[PDB]
Design a binder for this molecule. Sequence first.
Ligand code: GDP
Ligand code: K
Length: 307
Amino acid sequence: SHMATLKVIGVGGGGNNAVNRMIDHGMNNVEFIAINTDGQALNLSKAESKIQIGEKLTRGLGAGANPEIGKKAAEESREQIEDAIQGADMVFVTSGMGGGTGTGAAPVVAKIAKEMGALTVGVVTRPFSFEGRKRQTQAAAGVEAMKAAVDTLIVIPNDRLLDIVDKSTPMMEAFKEADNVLRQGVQGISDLIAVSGEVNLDFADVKTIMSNQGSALMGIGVSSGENRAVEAAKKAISSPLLETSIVGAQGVLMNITGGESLSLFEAQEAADIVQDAADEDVNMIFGTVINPELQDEIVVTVIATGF
Ligand SMILES: Nc1nc2c(ncn2[C@@H]2O[C@H](COP(=O)(O)OP(=O)(O)O)[C@@H](O)[C@H]2O)c(=O)[nH]1
Ligand SMILES: [K+]
């Protein structure tokens, strides 16, 4: 009966990069919106919906690292941003904090989306330490503004990308690894909404776990063979890229997809991995999907909140 309208919105350079790479990767049933002050970057966006903000302010340039320009640009294009969001049931706002457009404009976009009734998730990066202390301080203020404007917020410190590269990894490949946090969180929700589960979870459970919560973790894990349930759950909660780990979570939506071999015992093992790692008494919302096209693969999806 109900089919949730999901929109992913990139705000600023880094956010629009993410959107372009997610669109290249292929993702259906999601509307993408690109928002920027910088008209040069926007002309190259792959998104179906493009909103140039603050053209009277910047004359079509970026914000020159000034968050106040990004914020005033978003406020002045409020109506345009509302028109783009209208109809959304859920909005993901992604941006790199520390510059001028994303720092300043991404919390305004998030606010508008929450004010229109949408479940609003932010997925933002913090700058590398090598970008300097001022960039980090501006980013921190952006992160705080984002937290005040979203239902849930996922922060990716870009320094963590230095933990997963070797000395030759291309920068673009490291950036794709961070893109995965948003992409797989969105796909997980889209999949949860679209399939009926044998123990069914739907968009109302997502709203319950995510609405007005603060920090979150969104993770997916796939494994096969022996101990697949424990291994997939461990993968779902363990990302080296997250500021907010699973430790401390007090609400968890956990969906397990498997073939007809999916055992009750391994569903409990998987739930216990999450609960034990949270180190809290977790209020779990537990789902199960039987996909017979799967043989030996099991997929664990986790959304964690209540920190
Ligand atoms: N992970 C990642 N970080 C980015 C990317 N682009 C920019 N950043 C980071 O985002 C911050 C803000 O840059 P940018 O989004 O281009 O600035 P803005 O357009 O003024 O908001 C930078 O300081 C970098 O830390 C990207 O594609 N991926
Ligand atoms: K469902």
